[PDB]
């Protein structure tokens, strides 16, 4: 995780029930950016032809 600088206050209803308001600096500094890796495979599967 990361040490975010939080503030506890309502803000125009954008954190109404369980929603969060995040500054653009968080996106700019590439916090919470994540790398994902997938696997794709193919087989030859020889035939009678």
């Amino acid at each position: 995780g990361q040490n975010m600088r939080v503030a506890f206050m309502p803000w125009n209803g954008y954190n109404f029930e369980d929603s969060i308001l995040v500054s653009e600096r968080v996106v700019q500094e590439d916090r919470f950016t994540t790398i994902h890796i997938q696997e794709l495979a193919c087989v030859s599967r020889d035939t009678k032809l």
Binding site: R45, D46, T47, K48, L49
Partner: protein
């Protein structure tokens, strides 16, 4: 593949016809084939060697 007679029939350019022939070549013959191309595996062995 009688290119010489093709030349003397068409009155067409010498070795400048090659790119036109290549254009004809790159024209996807048999176009309906590419709608589905799945082919299965049908193999049954009677004798095994390892």
């Amino acid at each position: 593949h009688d290119f010489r007679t093709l030349m003397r029939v068409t009155r067409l350019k010498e070795e400048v016809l090659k790119e036109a022939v290549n254009l004809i070549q790159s024209l996807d013959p048999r176009p309906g084939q590419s709608i589905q191309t799945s082919e299965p595996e049908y193999v049954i062995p009677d004798v095994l060697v390892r």
